[PDB]
Symmetry: C4
Subunit: 463 residues, 4 copies
């Protein structure tokens, strides 16, 4: 039994390091700064030398147009060298051509107050697939003014902060030179290409670095609520598209196929309560999905080979970025559980074996009270979301209300804006919540543990 379990033990250990390497391998070290530089270059720089706003700060269409004609252009272009080529920071190819796309809503004049009408007029509804405007507004002289379909226009539905956005819309592809684009942009600014009905706009472009070998994929997303104003958001995604350069890169490819063998091995072992069984299943599952994604999704690299042919087009990577995110998401979670599986082997010692059974007994009593806990915890949340959330950012959405309360329990708080929001309930909410939750209810957990812990020490001491 011992050696039999010890047989599986090393199998697990061998399985550990293989994965630990792929993580270490598939992750370059300094990637962070590469993003950080890109981000600061775009997000953090003043729109114009005269203006103090950043892209993070954009409050208006006027703000936006400034940003376009402003730092963005300066951000994208450098001199240097072709001269049709520009290296960002001097280290980074601007890869192919940038693309701007927007979404427009059909005229919503249907909405009827009674009675106002000619004192309005019309309106435009909140973005929806139904409300999406396909009419060819404006001079109709190009893709900018002509609707295209998410099928015809290669692209995927993007999930924004207030809404999901289809790939379809009105778009334009920029130029290789800072000037030609400016001409294009100004033309789009001269003609009004951002109107009442423009809910959201996209700016997508990709960047390659040759020093380290990586691609940065950028989506600048700007939303226009029916309430007016601007909600900027951004995404910077590094990608390793060419997986084979260095011998180490090939060494990982071996390990990847090596790693593939292990899972297939565990697949068989999985075939016939228990917790570790329940655990083992998960790791196997995620592992598969991780691989499936890795193979017939990310390994495609078809867009690259296409773009490599014609480098004057827009290299749509939006999917490739999308998936490796999903990949890293899953890949990480696997590793997390993989470590947790190590506990199954720790019971060798008395103390551990003692502790092992304790937390097991801890579970049932906890799981009951946890229910009792969150019911209250959610009650405040739903309360706060009603009182606040038309005022305070932190409470804006019901999700972040829940989050906010955790930060409160930990002590991260903005109290002032709460008190500003409602001078009465704000204090009451904060006081009562901090009282019952943090003084009493939290302690009720720890109370349960002591009992179940001491009891297990008690009766096992009897043996």
């Amino acid at each position: 039994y011992l050696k039999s379990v010890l047989r599986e033990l090393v199998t697990y250990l061998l399985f550990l390091i293989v994965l630990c390497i792929l993580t270490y391998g598939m992750m370059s070290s300094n990637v962070y700064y590469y993003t950080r530089m890109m981000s600061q270059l775009f997000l953090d720089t003043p729109v114009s030398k005269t203006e103090k706003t950043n892209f993070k700060t954009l409050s208006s269409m006027e703000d936006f147009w400034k940003f376009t004609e402003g730092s963005l252009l300066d951000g994208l272009y450098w001199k240097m060298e072709a001269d049709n080529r520009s290296f960002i920071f001097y280290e980074n190819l601007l890869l192919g051509v940038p693309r701007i796309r927007q979404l427009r809503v059909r005229n919503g004049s249907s909405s009827i107050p009674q009675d106002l009408r000619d004192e309005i007029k019309e309106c435009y509804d909140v973005y929806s697939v139904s409300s999406e405007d396909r009419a060819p507004f404006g001079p109709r002289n190009g893709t900018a003014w002509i609707y295209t379909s998410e099928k015809d226009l290669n692209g995927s539905s993007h999930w924004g902060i207030i809404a999901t956005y289809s790939g379809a819309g009105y778009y334009l592809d920029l130029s290789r030179t800072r000037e030609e684009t400016a001409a294009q942009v100004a033309s789009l600014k001269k003609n009004v290409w951002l109107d009442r009905g423009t809910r959201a706009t996209f700016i997508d472009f990709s960047v390659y670095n040759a020093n380290i070998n990586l691609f940065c994929v950028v989506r600048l997303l700007v939303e226009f609520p029916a309430t007016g104003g601007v909600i900027p958001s951004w995404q910077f995604q590094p990608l390793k598209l060419i997986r084979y350069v260095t011998t180490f890169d090939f060494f990982l490819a071996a390990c990847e196929i090596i790693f593939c063998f292990f899972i297939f091995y565990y697949v068989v072992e999985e075939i016939l309560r228990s917790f570790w069984n329940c655990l083992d299943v998960v790791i196997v599952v995620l592992s598969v999905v991780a691989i499936g994604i890795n193979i017939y999704r990310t390994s495609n690299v078809e867009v690259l080979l296409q773009f490599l042919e014609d480098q004057n087009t827009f290299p749509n990577f939006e999917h490739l970025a999308y998936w490796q995110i999903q990949f890293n998401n899953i890949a990480a979670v696997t590793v997390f559980f993989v470590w947790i599986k190590l506990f199954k082997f720790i019971n060798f010692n008395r103390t551990m074996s003692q502790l092992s059974t304790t937390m097991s007994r801890c579970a049932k009593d906890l799981f009951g009270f946890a229910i009792m806990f969150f019911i209250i915890f959610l009650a405040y949340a739903q309360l706060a979301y009603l009182v606040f959330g038309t005022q305070v950012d932190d409470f804006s959405t019901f999700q972040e209300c829940i989050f906010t309360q955790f930060r409160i329990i930990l002590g991260d708080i903005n109290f002032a804006e709460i008190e500003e929001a409602n001078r009465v309930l704000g204090p009451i909410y904060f006081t009562t919540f901090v009282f019952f939750m943090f003084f009493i209810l939290l302690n009720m957990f720890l109370a349960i543990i002591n009992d179940t812990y001491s009891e297990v020490k008690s009766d096992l001491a009897q043996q």
Copy 2:
């Protein structure tokens, strides 16, 4: 008994979802940004392009006048389209006409130092209803220089940060165009309309959005302590005045009448200790008040129909805003308690039934020590309020002293300004407080729980 209780159970459940819908229904999603845009447009923008102060920052009359003639005007007006009409952000009707009002105090020269007199001269006392100045100061050519009464001038006493303010005062109604107002404002600036005796000023206007259907009601409040300086405060209230547009809006109206039936049902059941009884009463009570407000207060909508007739006047909404706040306040609290009522049904399981009786026994011992606790907790508060509170904002008022101490217990602290305030007691206060309260006294709670918890597990285990 079981099915009998189960009969009431579903009644509660049905009552839950009805309410959950009205909450979800009566609350639109994205309202937050609508406020946030309005706020940033006014509060957050520089007074003048040359000046770095915001409305939040106003330190002086000069600051104030700048703000009026400054961003405020630019905030209110847009072009566009009548041209007598302006859309804020382009999405928002400026609704009717803005109104400025101030409060003035009778000359307080009565206050006598001995002896100074001609070296002063006179003075003006802190605002009070008694001290309120009704004299027609200045050129006396209009409402600006002529006192009106809160009865004659439709309006309610507003509760400010240093004082409550009657609706009465000296006011002026602005114009539809940015220019005419500027002429008015400048005239009020040319003539001195803000003098030594001006304690507080109001700026009230309303804004409609047609994309979503909502009204934003704005009160810009500026106080002038007898100590000089400025204390700005602001309120942005969304309102749904027209409740009937979409079928969904009508569907809620049905549910509202449907929901009315349930309470009337519970009214009868309430008619004949116990805790749940004590609870059930509360929910019934609040529910009624919520409805009464909803009907003969908020449902009035008389001002709208009046304003709809004449759109060149000032649409006084101050009350309508006031009540829906009270409404949302009560409405929220109800929901909170409604969820809590769900516990009454959770005792089905042993574990829950176990936990249920535990916290019940927890109560008496806690309630005793809680008294013992706050006596100390308040002692520090009253101490801090004496030591600090002439220095530190956080301690300014005795209320916020209490609040501040909670943030300390949680770890939210500004220590520096404490140490700056008093280099001796500041540390001592902070150290001792953090010591006895957080190390010892908090733990004394949790100590009590363990005993009462383990004891209940102990003796019930005997059964």
Copy 3:
């Protein structure tokens, strides 16, 4: 026994409200903003319209001179009305005349490196009473260039942040008009009145408000370490000098004499372990000192009556401010203990009487471990002070090291600057400290309480 104790009970209660009133009475409500306005007017305003530094920010002599000739002058003067008079904010008399004073150190060339000499030359030592320079440097045409004595120059030793400073030094009294002062200041700037040997400078002036009746006393303190640079500090003290205006003010005077009777009563009762006895002594003690200060110190008001005669001089209030601080310090502490004395009466109930004896038994075991605790707690402190404190502000002095660790236990942290200071020990210190202290050692307290609590519940339950 019961009624006998009940006799003392009401005596205490009557004693409570009397004190509660004097606190409420002797403290006006809105004083905070009065300070806050003054502070922001001076501390918070840019030195010059072109410059972004505040008084809080001063880094250099050049910074300082700018501030003097800069915002300070603008801060002090207003127009308006005599015109020799100016109202700050328009609400505040500039009271009398401002005064600037500095401290200078004898030339410290004695300090000998071996060997440098003519490559230096000389030096100036850190401020001390010994090192204080009495030589009449400069043109010697006035008090600015002539040393005076703290006896001759009415004044008290002030306690600064890096050093205590005698009242003596080189000073100048300003003028009633913004211009004349500027001439004076410029002359002091033309001639070099701030030299290598100038360790610290003072700016003292007082301000009266007639709306509410109060005096604000201001000390602007600027230190010049031997290391160069500037360390600004400031003090704003409100004073109520004329205690008799309103009938309420006279009503307090009655209560004050009334309150005097109570203490004299308790004096006798104090005359013959125990804790409450030990407590009762303290309250009596502090009460006396509070009164003694109140009478033959603060009630003097001699400087006022002198200044009232000649309003063109400098009204030295530095002492009067100094004492009422001491007064408020003591006065507050008394109130704090007074509330605590209320516990002596709470044992009526079983639960309280139960809890009462528990914490009493809690004491001995705690007091032992507390020693064990701080020994470690101080160890880290002394460690951090050695590692940090040449780098991080928070650790600058050993005192604030102790303070800083409390904020860490609570979660208030600046970690970045720690890691920046020492990339190795910084993490180790922070990690280990947070580990042993917060995980283990804190819990060791709470462990003790449970035992001593449950035991007391246990054995008393046996009865």
Copy 4:
């Protein structure tokens, strides 16, 4: 036995104060501000009057060159007096001559994407000793363009934030006057002395203060990742080079030799489990290393005596600074343990002796669970490092991930940037982590303590 232990007790006490003095003695008080002034003078000042960036803010080569030609020069030079001499703040000799050095990497065109080539061209790899470029780029007219060796160029490998850097490289020595340097700098800017291949640059200079007797050694370090951009870092090290000036300084020298006797005494006593034995060893060890460093490393002072001869050269102190850091590091840690040794003497009292054996028994059960704890704690860390760390600064490196989680447990959090990084896992990570770790797992510690504490009180009470 008692007096025998009491014999060692005073030996320890005498050993305490000797060390406490050396700490107090070898540490001057106000050194902090001396650094703080230097830091703010360089780090905190705008690059140019027109520019808002600080040295901390440098984002680009252009930023850097500005800083050089900018505030740095102004920071170093002052007038005053030779005039070839300049006093920083007027209090500080610029000591000798500043020196700039950079590191360059061989052209990395070897890196092959397939296929791009002439669309790149070339590249430059991440810094390494191998990749280090020794070629004499540029006009080759001086040390700036000529490679030197860390042997030939006196210097030590420096440990930067992304990499360790050899002392070797391309350097230049500046001039005594602000102008001549500017000519040099401009020449280095005219010619391109910062190219694609420049990974990191150094700016080293030293400063003496004669008021207090100290040296400040400065290393300004600027890194250029292969990703472009700039990563500034800085070091300010005070040094006491001349240990003999004041009699007090000589008094310490006596104590130092006195202190040397004690350790040699303990050396013998150390010669023959136990914990205190294990402890005593450590203190002895560190003490030795501290002394050895103090003698044949720091006491060398050879560079000074050399520099004192020729004051126009670069006074390389980099080592001297390096070691006294190591010295202070060790010196501090010793003191820390020295205090801890005091516990060995505290068992005189019952309570202490009681507590002593408790925590001893606490150990074994804790040490087991601590393992169980960190396994999970690290799991999240490794998870967060995969999910985040390409986005969030706080998670950038695996080390700081661990650190970040502690700050979370304490409540120091930036949640926003987490949610921005990954809108899905970010919340999940934060929520689950805060849940299991802070609610459950932490309490599991405290659970263990209660058992082991109460049990020890229980059975010892039986005696």
